[PDB]
Design an enzyme around this catalytic site. Structure first.
Site, mmCIF file in Angstrom:
data_model
loop_
_atom_site.group_PDB
_atom_site.id
_atom_site.type_symbol
_atom_site.label_atom_id
_atom_site.label_comp_id
_atom_site.label_asym_id
_atom_site.label_seq_id
_atom_site.Cartn_x
_atom_site.Cartn_y
_atom_site.Cartn_z
ATOM 1 N N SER A 143 -11.252 -1.182 -0.099
ATOM 2 C CA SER A 143 -9.941 -1.141 0.545
ATOM 3 C C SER A 143 -10.041 -1.394 2.042
ATOM 4 O O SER A 143 -9.085 -1.878 2.652
ATOM 5 C CB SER A 143 -9.276 0.219 0.317
ATOM 6 O OG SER A 143 -8.876 0.396 -1.024
ATOM 7 N N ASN B 280 -14.216 -0.147 -6.294
ATOM 8 C CA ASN B 280 -15.261 0.760 -5.824
ATOM 9 C C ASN B 280 -16.034 1.400 -6.971
ATOM 10 O O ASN B 280 -16.426 2.567 -6.892
ATOM 11 C CB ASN B 280 -14.667 1.862 -4.944
ATOM 12 C CG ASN B 280 -13.848 1.316 -3.781
ATOM 13 O OD1 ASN B 280 -14.184 0.297 -3.193
ATOM 14 N ND2 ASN B 280 -12.765 2.002 -3.448
ATOM 15 N N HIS C 280 -3.621 5.974 3.850
ATOM 16 C CA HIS C 280 -4.385 4.809 3.412
ATOM 17 C C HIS C 280 -3.764 3.513 3.931
ATOM 18 O O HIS C 280 -4.452 2.659 4.502
ATOM 19 C CB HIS C 280 -4.446 4.832 1.882
ATOM 20 C CG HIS C 280 -5.336 3.804 1.266
ATOM 21 N ND1 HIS C 280 -4.861 2.592 0.814
ATOM 22 C CD2 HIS C 280 -6.659 3.828 0.955
ATOM 23 C CE1 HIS C 280 -5.856 1.898 0.289
ATOM 24 N NE2 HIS C 280 -6.956 2.629 0.354
ATOM 25 N N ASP D 177 0.842 -1.192 0.000
ATOM 26 C CA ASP D 177 0.000 0.000 0.000
ATOM 27 C C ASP D 177 0.883 1.250 0.000
ATOM 28 O O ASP D 177 1.945 1.248 -0.628
ATOM 29 C CB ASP D 177 -0.940 -0.061 1.206
ATOM 30 C CG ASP D 177 -2.230 0.673 0.993
ATOM 31 O OD1 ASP D 177 -2.206 1.909 0.939
ATOM 32 O OD2 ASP D 177 -3.287 0.008 0.912
#
Ligand SMILES: [Ca+2]
Length: 279
Positions: free
Chosen positions: A224, A161, A69, A39
């Site tokens: 996520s 998404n 994130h 990530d």
């Protein structure tokens, strides 16, 4: 063990019904397992990781999480307050820049790195990789995820998404990994969650409280956010000896809460991750 006034997502994965606030879990809590969070990095000094997090690789100038994130996802895997597997070891691999972007060649390199690096680590109960990222379909990205899984790592990836069929996104569309959709606290499919026959499982993904950079916390939404719930659950179940990296996704689907979710299109599984804990 029981965590009172837990984030709703943790309570949800230890209950057959929505609307509870206690997270019930075995005290072993993922000890002896390892989770790579691939990530934007991890703020390893965050008190919520208790020294159990470390950066092992970056593809940019710094190894710091300048975005948040990655720190948020790592917190849902294994922070003290916000994590599923509260005693697991967390390893950060920074393949995304601080704007959250990254080239596919760098993401592939990061996956190949984990497949090798795990041989240098003491992870007696097994290894998991959490990939809360994705883009348009790429056969090379899918192949890299399949390699990582084949090497003996439980790979969990976000469905995406786009409120669309995940067959057109990578690494979501790779069949051999564990592709994770998102639900909300009322047991609806999250309005943004991708769907389709390639999904293996759903986890909590709307309004998820976890760690953030600067030693803070915040609530955000996404597939996520669902992915680290499943990654953490896998580490938790591997430590308990219930499953292995090769079969953890299947075991999670087999033992899931079935039929509880609404707004699931025909052809998508109606399965919600569940730890089957019994005091
Ligand atoms: Ca799969």
């Amino acid at each position: 063990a029981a965590q009172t006034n837990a984030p709703w997502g943790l309570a949800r994965i230890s209950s057959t019904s929505p609307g509870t606030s206690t997270y019930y879990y075995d005290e072993s809590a993922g000890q002896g397992s390892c989770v790579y969070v691939i990530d934007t990095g991890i703020e390893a000094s965050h008190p919520e990781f208790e020294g159990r997090a470390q950066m092992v690789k970056t593809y940019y100038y710094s190894s710091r999480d300048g975005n948040g994130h990655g720190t948020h996802c790592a917190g849902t895997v294994g922070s003290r307050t916000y994590g599923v597997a509260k005693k697991t070891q967390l390893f950060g691999v920074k393949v995304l820049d601080d704007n959250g972007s990254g080239q596919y060649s760098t993401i592939i390199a990061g996956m190949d790195f984990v497949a090798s690096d795990k041989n240098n680590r003491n992870c007696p109960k097994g290894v998991v990789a959490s990939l809360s990222l994705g883009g348009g379909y790429s056969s090379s990205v899918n192949s890299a995820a399949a390699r990582l899984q084949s090497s003996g790592v439980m790979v969990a990836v976000a469905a995406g998404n786009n409120n669309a069929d995940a067959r057109n996104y990578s690494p979501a569309s790779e069949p051999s990994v564990c592709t994770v959709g998102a639900s909300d606290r009322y047991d609806r499919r999250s309005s943004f969650s991708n769907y389709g026959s390639v999904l293996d499982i759903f986890g909590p993904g709307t309004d998820i409280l976890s760690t953030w950079i600067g030693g803070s916390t915040r609530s955000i939404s996404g597939t996520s956010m669902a992915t680290p719930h499943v990654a953490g659950l896998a580490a938790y179940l591997m430590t308990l000896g219930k499953t292995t990296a090769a079969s953890a996704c299947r075991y999670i689907a087999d033992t899931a809460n079935k039929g509880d979710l609404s707004n699931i299109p025909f052809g998508t599984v109606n399965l919600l991750a569940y730890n089957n804990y019994q005091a």
